[PDB]
Design a protein around this ligand. Structure first.
Ligand SMILES: [Mg+2]
Ligand SMILES: [Mg+2]
Ligand SMILES: [Mg+2]
Ligand SMILES: [Mg+2]
Ligand SMILES: [Mg+2]
Ligand SMILES: [Mg+2]
Ligand SMILES: [Mg+2]
Ligand SMILES: [Mg+2]
Ligand SMILES: [Mg+2]
Ligand SMILES: [Mg+2]
Ligand SMILES: [Mg+2]
Ligand SMILES: [Mg+2]
Ligand SMILES: [Mg+2]
Ligand SMILES: [Mg+2]
Ligand SMILES: [Mg+2]
Ligand SMILES: [Mg+2]
Ligand SMILES: [Mg+2]
Ligand SMILES: [Mg+2]
Ligand SMILES: [Mg+2]
Ligand SMILES: [Mg+2]
Ligand SMILES: [Mg+2]
Ligand SMILES: [Mg+2]
Ligand SMILES: [Mg+2]
Ligand SMILES: [Mg+2]
Ligand SMILES: [Mg+2]
Ligand SMILES: [Mg+2]
Ligand SMILES: [Mg+2]
Ligand SMILES: [Mg+2]
Ligand SMILES: [Mg+2]
Ligand SMILES: [Mg+2]
Ligand SMILES: [Mg+2]
Ligand SMILES: [Mg+2]
Ligand SMILES: [Mg+2]
Ligand SMILES: [Mg+2]
Ligand SMILES: [Mg+2]
Ligand SMILES: [Mg+2]
Ligand SMILES: [Mg+2]
Ligand SMILES: [Mg+2]
Ligand SMILES: [Mg+2]
Ligand SMILES: [Mg+2]
Ligand SMILES: [Mg+2]
Ligand SMILES: [Mg+2]
Ligand SMILES: [Mg+2]
Ligand SMILES: [Mg+2]
Ligand SMILES: [Mg+2]
Ligand SMILES: [Mg+2]
Ligand SMILES: [Mg+2]
Ligand SMILES: [Mg+2]
Ligand SMILES: [Mg+2]
Ligand SMILES: [Mg+2]
Ligand SMILES: [Mg+2]
Ligand SMILES: [Mg+2]
Ligand SMILES: [Mg+2]
Ligand SMILES: [Mg+2]
Ligand SMILES: [Mg+2]
Ligand SMILES: [Mg+2]
Ligand SMILES: [Mg+2]
Ligand SMILES: [Mg+2]
Ligand SMILES: [Mg+2]
Ligand SMILES: [Mg+2]
Ligand SMILES: [Mg+2]
Lengths: 81, 205, 80, 56, 87
RNA sequence: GAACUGAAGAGUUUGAUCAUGGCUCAGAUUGAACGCUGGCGGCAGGCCUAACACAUGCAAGUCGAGCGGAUGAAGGGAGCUUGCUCCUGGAUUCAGCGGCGGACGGGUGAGUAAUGCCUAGGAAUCUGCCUGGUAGUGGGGGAUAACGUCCGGAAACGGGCGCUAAUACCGCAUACGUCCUGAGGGAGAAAGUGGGGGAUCUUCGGACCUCACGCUAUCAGAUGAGCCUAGGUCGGAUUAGCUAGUUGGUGGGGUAAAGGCCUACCAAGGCGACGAUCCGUAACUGGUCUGAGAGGAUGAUCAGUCACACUGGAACUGAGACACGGUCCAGACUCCUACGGGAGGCAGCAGUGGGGAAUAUUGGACAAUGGGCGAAAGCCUGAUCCAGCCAUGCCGCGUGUGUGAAGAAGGUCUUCGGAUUGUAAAGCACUUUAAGUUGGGAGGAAGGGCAGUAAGUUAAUACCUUGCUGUUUUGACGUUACCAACAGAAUAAGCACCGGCUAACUUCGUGCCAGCAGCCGCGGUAAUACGAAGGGUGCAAGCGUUAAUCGGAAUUACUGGGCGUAAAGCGCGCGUAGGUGGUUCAGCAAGUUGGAUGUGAAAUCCCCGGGCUCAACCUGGGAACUGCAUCCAAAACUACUGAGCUA
C-alpha cells in the first residue's frame, strides 16, 4: 500500500529523518511521492525536533495512507501541540 | 603540521621586523638582521615580479604562522565573500583564536598563544575551545581558565604587551584576565606595508 | 481545446489515407541560423477528398493502423 | 621458474619466452594455460613420481 | 529448488495447472459449438448452443479462469453473429 | 537584502629583426598506480581488468485464532505402595494440507543506436494489500494429502490398495451495482473463525445477541504498470539505395486495451542526401571535472529509468514474472557413484584461484529506521545499523613555549683577516594538546508485559477499542561522545628542487667518460646543469614520478582565424537541390516580442541561517534549473497571400 515512514539521512551516529509518503515496496531512501516534514533525534539549540505539514498529512491520511509506528506517535505528538 | 625551528632566519630572509620573538630585548642585537641566511648572505640579488609576489605571500604566512593549504582555503573564502578580497583575507586572518589571544596580551608571541590555546587554557563563550583556527565573532569574551590564571607566562605577556601600541579593538580586563572582541579590525587598523595586491596577483595566475 | 497541425498534401495514392508534410523552422543550436525541417505524417481521410497540393489541417487521435495516428478535420486551401 | 599450484597462463607464457619445457608434478593446467599450450607448440608433461621427471 | 517453500509452490502450481486446463478446454469447446453452428447456417442450433454456452462462460469468468472482458467480448460477438444470421 | 564578481603569459627557427607556425612549460582535477617517508582523529571511498571459474557458511519466511493428525506438561484424582500403573483433563512443539510472501529489498552493465533514455503531450486499459460508499454471506455435494498397508532402490527415494477434514474444490439458491442483449428478456457470487452474554429451546454440541478478523459483487479515490504521438540522443559516403506482412483497405480472429498483433481477399504502396540501409562503437539521465563565458571531456560513489541472472528457447502459477537463490527442454563445463543411477549455477554478503600496475573481514546485532507473515506477543531479514583493513581523498590537531653570546665544540667556505650553520645547541625556566594510566558519564528508546480507572459499542458496569495512572522490562556499537586526576619534554619529519623558463649557490671528485634531461640543452682538466658535501628554496604526514581530461591554444576561430608572396580561389563556363531577395499599399500571425498558467523529481552548484569545541560533514528556507507546452496581446522586420511601380 501507500505508507508514511521515516527516510534516514544525516551521518554516522547523527541521524536525521524525512517524513515521506512512499509506495511500500520501495527502498527506504529510494523514490517517494512527497515529503511532509522532518524529525531530528538530537536537535538542540535553534534546531527544531520535528516539523510536519498538517494539511498534507491530513490529506494523505484521508486518501488511505498507513503511517508507521514512529510516524503515528510523532504525528499524534505534533497534533498534541 | 607546524613550522618548528629557527624563528629568526625568517625575518632576515623576508627583510622586515616580522615579529617572532617576544620583542623584549631587540631584533637588531640578536642576529645582525641585514643579510639573507646562509653562506651567500652578503649578496643582494635583485629579484623578479614573481619573486616579489612570493615574498609578500610568504611574509604574511610567516607573520600569522599558517601553512599553505589552510591559506588557500582562506583565500577561497575571501574571494567568495563580498567586498574586495584583498582586505577580506586580512579580516579573516585577524580573527583566528591564537591571534586574538596574542592581541589581548595573554601570550608573548603567536607560538606561545598557540601553546596556550592548544593546551586547553582558554574559554571563548564560557566554554573551552582549543582549536587555533576558531573564527571568533564580534562580541565574544575570551578569558582564562581559573586553574590556568596563575601561570607566570600570562603575567610577563601582559606586562610586556603593556608597551607595544594600543590595538584599540579589544578591551582586556587586566585584573582577572578577561577580554572582549568588539569587531574585526579594518584595513586602516593594521600596518600599511603589506601589499595584499601582490598576494591577490600571485593567486590569480 | 484540441491542438492541430497544418500542412501540404504530398501523396494520396493510398486508400482512405493521405500523406501530409508539415514545415517547421528551428534555430540551429550552435551557429544560430534558422533552418527549415520537414515532418511527414500519415493522416486518415475517410472519404478520399484530399488531392496532392492541398493545404489541410489534422489532429491527433488513437492509432488507426501502424504508422497512422492522425485524422484530418478540414481542407482549407484546395489545390488547383 | 618454480612455484606451487596448478599451471597458469603466467608460467605458460614464461616458458613461451624462454624455449622452456613445462613440467607439472602432481598438478594440472587450467583452461587458459591449456588454450595457450594448444595455440603454440609448447610441450607440457605431467608426472606423479620424481624419477620419471629425472629420466625425461 | 533449494527451500521447502519453492518445492511446495511448484507442487501447488502443477495442481493449479491441472485444474485450470480442463476448465479452459470446457469454455473453448462450448464456444466452438456455437461457432460451428453459426458456420453451418443453422438458426435453432445457434440459439440452443448460445443458451447452453452463456452460463458456463459467465461462471468460468467469475471463477477467475478468464477475464470478464473476454466473456463480454465473446457474448457480444456471438450475439451479433446469431442476430445477423436470423435475418 | 542575497543568490556573483569576470579573462596574464614564457622558452625554442636568425648574424640580428618582424611575421607565420608547430612543439614544450607554468593551473585545476582522478575510483588512480609506483618510489621514499610515516603520529592522531572526524567524514567519506575502495576489482576501472576476466558478464573468468568457483570450495565453505549465511542472504525468504511466516500463520495452530483456516484444517485433520500426533506430541502429549501442571493438576484433580483412583488403585497398589514410594514409586509405579490408570483415567480425566490438558500446556507446549510441527512433518502434511491450506492462506499470504517469494515479481520487493540486493547485484551487474553483457546486449541495445532505438519496443531504450530525456522533454512535452493523450486514449482505447488493467491494478493484490489501502481509504470511503452500496448490496450480501442461504443451503448441499463428491473428493485428496497426512495416515495404515504391500514391493523395489546403495542412497537419493519411487510405486499399487484402503481411510479423513478445511477459509481446499464443485453444483444449487438469490443480485443494490455488474455482463451482454435493442426495447423484450436472459447471465453471473461467497467462508468461516476467535472472545463474551440477557431471555428461549436444545447436548448455552449449539441456535440467538454483540464485537473483532475474514470472504463475495460493484463505484469512486490513491498507488503501480501496460499502450500511442511530436521533438532530441556517437563516428563513418573509401557505406546510395532499402522493404513483399512490406505500405494501405475490407471481413474475421486475438488482447486488459488501440494496432499487420495475426489471418483471408483487394490495391501497389512505404522509407531515403532534412542521410534510409549497412559497418564500427556505446546503457541513458539528474549530474561530475575543467572553462571568464560560449564550449570541451565524461556517466565511479548518490538518485530515477532500462536490460541481464552459466548459454539458447518455452510456457505454467499468480493482481502482478516469461520469474535473481521457481518449472520444462536442449547445450557447454565440473562432480558424485555402490557403475544400477543423480546433482550444480556467488553479475546476493564474506571468501578462493586467475588476470592485472592496482582495490578490503569466512566480523556483530536485529538495539534504531524499513520489508514479509501474524491478531498479538513474536519469528525472519549479509536490507540496514555498526565494527575490521588500506595516507585513497577532504578537513582538523600534534611533533613543545620563553630566555639564552664563551656568537662554545664540530662541519663548510675563505682574500687566512674571518664568515656561515646560529638563539640554532647546551644552560636556565615553564606547559601537558594528542597518545599512556585511573575514575566518572549523557544521547541514539519509540515500545512491550502486568494492574487500575474513565469514556464508546451493544443489550448489557461482558469481551473488545481508545485517554490516562502505577509497577516492571530494552543498546550491537560500548572500555560511546564527553568530563576530571597523575607522570614527564617525555612518544612523534620527511620528500622534492637550487642554468633559463621558475623561488633558491659554492667547493670537492670525474674529464664527450660516468651520467642528466619537460623544452632549450649540459659533460672534451677550474662543470652554479653529472655524483657527493655544506648552505638555501618550496611543500609538509606527506612529498615526487607515471598515466589521463580541460586550460593556456584566438591551434577548428558561433562568441573569436584565414587563402597575391608563409597552408589555402576549383583551368574556365552553364546549370539542379539549396541559400539569399529592388520598391509601394492591404491582410494574415509561422518566425519575432511581452504577459499568464502548468511543468521542469529529490540530492548536487549558489545565497542567507542552524547544529556538531572549529573545519570537513549534516541540515532549514530561498534562488536557480537558462528548457518545453497551452492560452492572451502587438505588428517594425523576415515568411505567406492579393494588388501595384520601374532604378
Ligand atoms: Mg593536512
Ligand atoms: Mg484499422
Ligand atoms: Mg469470482
Ligand atoms: Mg644562436
Ligand atoms: Mg567488474
Ligand atoms: Mg508446522
Ligand atoms: Mg534495484
Ligand atoms: Mg551495458
Ligand atoms: Mg548497429
Ligand atoms: Mg448461480
Ligand atoms: Mg457457499
Ligand atoms: Mg473458495
Ligand atoms: Mg484471522
Ligand atoms: Mg521519437
Ligand atoms: Mg497475408
Ligand atoms: Mg477487425
Ligand atoms: Mg497478461
Ligand atoms: Mg505496434
Ligand atoms: Mg485487418
Ligand atoms: Mg548513415
Ligand atoms: Mg558494451
Ligand atoms: Mg577560452
Ligand atoms: Mg553517453
Ligand atoms: Mg559499482
Ligand atoms: Mg541508479
Ligand atoms: Mg535461461
Ligand atoms: Mg493467469
Ligand atoms: Mg523479468
Ligand atoms: Mg525468485
Ligand atoms: Mg545466486
Ligand atoms: Mg562476492
Ligand atoms: Mg559467473
Ligand atoms: Mg597476478
Ligand atoms: Mg592498491
Ligand atoms: Mg529490525
Ligand atoms: Mg508461534
Ligand atoms: Mg536464517
Ligand atoms: Mg548475521
Ligand atoms: Mg587517516
Ligand atoms: Mg603511497
Ligand atoms: Mg669552527
Ligand atoms: Mg537511553
Ligand atoms: Mg632565480
Ligand atoms: Mg671541477
Ligand atoms: Mg639544469
Ligand atoms: Mg648537481
Ligand atoms: Mg600531463
Ligand atoms: Mg579552444
Ligand atoms: Mg595541451
Ligand atoms: Mg568567424
Ligand atoms: Mg591563422
Ligand atoms: Mg604558396
Ligand atoms: Mg613557395
Ligand atoms: Mg582563377
Ligand atoms: Mg534556384
Ligand atoms: Mg526587401
Ligand atoms: Mg525564396
Ligand atoms: Mg532539484
Ligand atoms: Mg558553529
Ligand atoms: Mg523557486
Ligand atoms: Mg493585428
Amino acid at each position: 500500500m501507500v505508507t508514511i515512514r521515516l527516510a534516514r539521512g544525516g551521518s554516522k551516529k547523527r541521524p536525521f529523518y524525512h517524513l515521506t509518503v512512499t509506495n511500500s515496496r520501495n527502498a527506504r531512501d529510494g523514490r517517494f511521492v512527497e515529503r511532509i516534514g522532518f524529525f531530528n533525534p538530537v536537535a538542540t539549540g535553534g534546531e527544531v525536533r520535528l516539523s510536519v505539514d498538517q494539511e498534507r498529512a491530513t490529506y494523505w491520511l484521508g486518501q488511505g495512507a498507513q503511517p508507521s509506528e514512529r510516524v503515528a506517535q510523532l504525528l499524534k505528538d505534533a497534533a498534541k501541540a | 603540521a607546524r613550522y618548528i625551528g629557527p624563528k629568526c632566519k625568517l625575518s632576515r630572509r623576508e627583510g622586515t621586523d616580522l615579529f617572532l620573538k617576544s620583542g623584549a630585548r631587540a631584533l637588531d642585537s640578536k642576529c645582525k638582521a641585514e643579510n639573507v641566511p646562509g653562506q651567500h648572505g652578503q649578496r643582494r640579488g635583485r629579484l623578479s615580479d614573481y619573486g616579489l609576489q612570493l615574498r609578500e605571500k610568504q611574509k604574511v604566512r610567516r607573520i600569522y604562522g599558517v601553512l599553505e593549504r589552510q591559506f588557500r582555503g582562506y583565500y577561497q573564502e575571501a574571494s567568495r565573500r563580498k567586498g574586495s578580497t584583498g582586505e577580506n583575507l586580512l579580516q579573516l586572518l585577524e580573527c583566528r583564536l591564537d591571534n586574538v589571544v596574542y592581541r589581548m596580551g595573554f601570550g608573548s608571541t603567536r607560538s606561545e598563544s598557540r601553546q596556550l590555546v592548544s593546551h586547553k587554557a582558554i574559554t571563548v563563550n564560557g566554554q573551552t575551545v582549543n582549536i587555533p583556527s576558531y573564527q571568533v565573532k564580534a562580541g565574544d569574551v575570551v578569558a582564562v581558565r581559573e586553574k590556568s590564571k596563575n601561570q607566570l607566562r600570562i603575567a610577563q605577556a601582559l606586562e610586556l604587551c603593556g608597551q607595544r601600541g594600543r590595538v584599540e579593538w579589544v578591551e582586556v580586563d587586566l585584573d582577572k584576565k578577561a577580554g572582549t572582541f568588539k569587531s574585526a579590525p579594518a584595513r586602516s587598523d593594521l600596518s600599511a606595508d603589506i601589499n595584499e595586491n601582490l598576494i591577490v596577483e600571485l593567486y590569480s595566475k | 481545446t484540441v491542438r492541430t497541425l497544418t500542412g501540404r498534401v504530398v501523396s494520396d495514392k493510398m486508400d482512405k489515407t493521405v500523406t501530409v508534410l508539415i514545415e517547421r523552422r528551428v534555430k540551429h543550436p550552435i551557429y544560430g541560423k534558422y533552418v527549415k525541417r520537414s515532418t511527414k505524417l500519415h493522416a486518415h481521410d475517410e472519404s478520399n477528398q484530399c488531392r496532392i497540393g492541398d493545404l489541410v489541417t489534422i489532429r491527433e487521435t488513437r492509432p488507426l493502423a501502424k504508422t497512422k495516428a492522425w485524422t484530418l478535420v478540414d481542407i482549407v486551401e484546395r489545390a488547383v | 621458474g618454480g612455484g606451487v599450484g596448478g599451471i597458469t597462463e603466467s608460467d605458460a607464457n614464461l616458458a613461451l619466452a624462454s624455449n622452456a619445457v613445462l613440467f607439472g608434478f602432481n598438478v594440472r593446467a587450467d583452461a587458459g594455460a591449456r588454450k595457450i599450450v594448444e595455440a603454440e607448440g609448447l610441450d607440457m608433461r605431467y608426472y606423479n613420481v620424481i624419477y620419471d621427471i629425472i629420466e625425461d | 529448488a533449494n527451500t521447502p517453500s519453492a518445492k511446495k509452490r511448484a507442487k501447488q502450481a502443477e495442481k493449479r495447472r491441472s485444474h485450470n486446463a480442463s476448465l479452459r478446454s470446457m469454455v473453448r469447446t462450448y464456444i466452438k459449438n456455437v461457432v460451428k453452428a453459426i458456420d453451418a447456417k443453422d438458426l435453432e442450433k445457434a440459439q440452443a448452443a448460445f443458451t447452453a454456452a452463456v452460463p458456463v462462460i459467465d461462471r468460468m469468468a467469475d471463477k477467475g479462469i478468464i477475464h470478464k472482458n473476454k466473456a463480454a467480448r465473446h457474448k457480444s460477438r456471438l450475439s451479433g453473429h446469431i442476430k445477423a444470421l436470423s435475418t
